[PDB]
Amino acid sequence: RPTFYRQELNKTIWEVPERYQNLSPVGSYGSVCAAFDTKTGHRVAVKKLSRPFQSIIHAKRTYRELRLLKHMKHENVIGLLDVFTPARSLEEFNDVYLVTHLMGADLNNIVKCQKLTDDHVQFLIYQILRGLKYIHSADIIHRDLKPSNLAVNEDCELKILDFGLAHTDDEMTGYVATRWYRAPEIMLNWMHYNQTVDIWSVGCIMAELLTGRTLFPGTDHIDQLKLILRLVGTPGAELLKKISSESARNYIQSLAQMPKMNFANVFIGANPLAVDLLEKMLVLDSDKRITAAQALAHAYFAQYHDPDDEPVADPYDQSFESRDLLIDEWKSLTYDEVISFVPPP
Template sequence: QYIHSAGVVHRDLKPSNLGVNENYEIKILDFGLARQTESEMTGYVVTRWYRAPEIILNWMHYNQTVDIWSVGCILAEMITGRVLFPGGDYFDELNKIIEVIGSPQPSLISKMESKHAQDYLKMLPYKQKKNFKEVFPTMNALEIDLLEKMLELDPEKRLSATECLAHPYLEEYQDSDPDPPAEKYDDSFENLDLGIAEWKSNVLVFKSHGSHDIRSENPEPTRYLTTLVQFLVVC
């Protein structure tokens, strides 16, 4: 929730990018692929097994809900002990998703920017969504309900991080004093065209502030139990 409130999408959430200590405190790791939501996105992100369908289909302007899809895959893996969609390649991954979630509706296909993606999906045989109670027989009703809403094919209907936290499955773990929303992340400095001497000068100015002062003014997103991670702690 905190990361998303800053307008940032992690884009590579997977079990190996979650650090857990003996007190079950969790931190999100590796922001190397993170981007602002306003940026043009690429389809070549996220480890394949946790990749949202809109990334596989190369939607250029996806949003934070790609992270929610990834966390849904992680949640299912934590409960069942197996990878949910272990695709061997791009096409196999999409087919494994459709096998469980069902074929996308025509209204969703029409919203896709890629004509190639539209044509490919129209060629596939229609698949009915499987009953999650049969796919996940060990899950209770609340777990299934949350998972279904996180693994919604249409990203506009998929739960946000805030909505995940408000789900009844997490009700007893609600934070009575939640972290305030983050300020929008400003990465304009990355586009500056400076010479080597100017960059060195900026680095010295940065260091002169002291790491303690900088952290106190702009806490690292990984210090916060975001909505994406808070629900994992209680599983």
Template sequence: MAIAARSRSGFYRQEVNRTVWEVPERYRDLKQIGTGAYGTVCSAWDRRTGAQVAIKKLHRPFQSKLFAKRAYRELRLLKHMRHENVIGLLDVFTAEISLDRFRDFYLVMPFMGTDLGKLMKMEKLTEDRVQFLVYQILKGLKYIHSAGIVHRDLKPGNLAINPDCELKILDFGLARQADAEMTGYVVTRWYRAPEVILNWMHYTQTGKRRVLIVGMLWDVGWVFLERKTLLSGVAVDIWSAGCIMAEMLLGKPLFKGSDHLDQLREIMKITGTPSPDFVVKLQSQDAKNYIRSLPKVPKKDLHYIFSKASSNAVCVLERMLLLDPECRASASEALELPFFNEFRDIEEETEALPYDQTMDNTDLPLDQWKRHTFTEILTFRPPRDSKGTSL
């Protein structure tokens, strides 16, 4: 339903599910395709390029300092990403022309159509499709990691896919904070690295019982790491990629824990009980005690579990699903495995410019986050197509 009032030349208003969207004339036929606590996404047709796009409207991005910082961070991340396997920004706009009236802004991204989670529910993937999809995941991770960024919440729903089986890593979960807030959001643990779960562990006294608590203490989503911790950080994404590849080959999740402790048990049924060398590296003393209390379980042969997969495919899993994060292959190392030879194009395996995380580690008042966001919108330059034309 279009609304007649206009606030700026070249823009129009449209009501989408009782929310007013104020967008440039070039974007037409808005249809809601997703919504969450922090924003709503519509598909639209870009009359300038003739392409379908996804437009995200953040939900009250400046309602608090925390929301404002998240909105600023999401915008800067999307502006930085320029890789075919990582979601990037086609456009960003606001209908307001002055900072004092600035309330909302919109992010325009490629429209993909579906995600890997939905695709796997619809069909069993052939091994050659698994090859192509995992190759794209690893190319995207190599790019992200080279910028000093770790995704940390990689799962099938964060892997967007278009009808040509082209894949982009995305994350609309930037603002999620804690498991307690994640109503209905439990699947993430199936792809979570064991060292992450182990290092959240602590005991609490409840009467005469000591209860093991596994909690999530960080923002889920992209995280920026110093170089000294980057290597251990990227291994978290490699584990998730291994879980996702295993699910593609099996047609079901490999580690389907009902809670965090059950998740660890499911992992160790296959990886075996951790070695003493691994246990001493854990930060949590309670996690060390817990692991040492477990009965010894031998490691299982992945060739037996994935008996229908090729030896080269299982070799990739063996390099990614290692309990010790220091032993897992990096994205660059995994790309060199024989499984990807058929699709490999080294020129496409590019690295990113370092991401300047100075502002992400800064504590500013709300009005300054708002000002910085407005400046980022005004300074946006759209990516160029293969002919060097701005989109």
């Protein structure tokens, strides 16, 4: 067991191992400090979870997040450097701290303030898909891909972060970037969704890197739907049969029919192979979208594709999600995962 020291920062008591030095508040699910990790030599982010076991829903969300972060081991995905509690027994266990690499700029800063060549777009989207192939191979859905959840460094290397761990209604209302990257079937709850929602998000992001502008900046759910259908066309009978809500089907059939537009006249001057890939991502029927593994083999990435260096994940057991347990049982499961953590090399 390491030696811990205590300190109050912005009316919060932090108790952390001696290896973490020069704690500096950064932001506030929990509060976050920047720190220097003397064991690894890295600048790190230390997150103290806020009330992790207040209710059954919160306790299960705490367990879900810890299981997910412990599993992710890939160059293009955020990983867990450390997890600790100052408690010495389960009976006094109450606080959870997570440690990750400190991230600097996100894709927002780059897209808004930099001139991007086609080679830049190729490399950035390639890395997103390489991480997604890994994530989807474990039957995990990210659910919240958007520019602010993608970290980029000085060498244009990219990491996916901030997995969707189950957003409020107010957060998705109005003219908000938290909705502009979501697939229409999940934005309007048309049907049970799957991992293909993430590929829709990648298409929205790729289009924004090419033009410098948000693809579907709707002012509300319905305005956004109209922008989407003007580009990709209104649904045909095949997809309407797959929409579970009769009222959603009724609403769709109230709209005048529209053909799919010519993407070369939308993305003027773009690499024709980029246009081709966008048409395969931004497909309304989610059954027919290109997958991450298929997209990596597309000719647009010929400069970077290496099938021997695009790994898949170890199997991931999510059976706990259908389990009904009491707070103290979720809390005991979490305690076991903290004490069994083994750090990376």
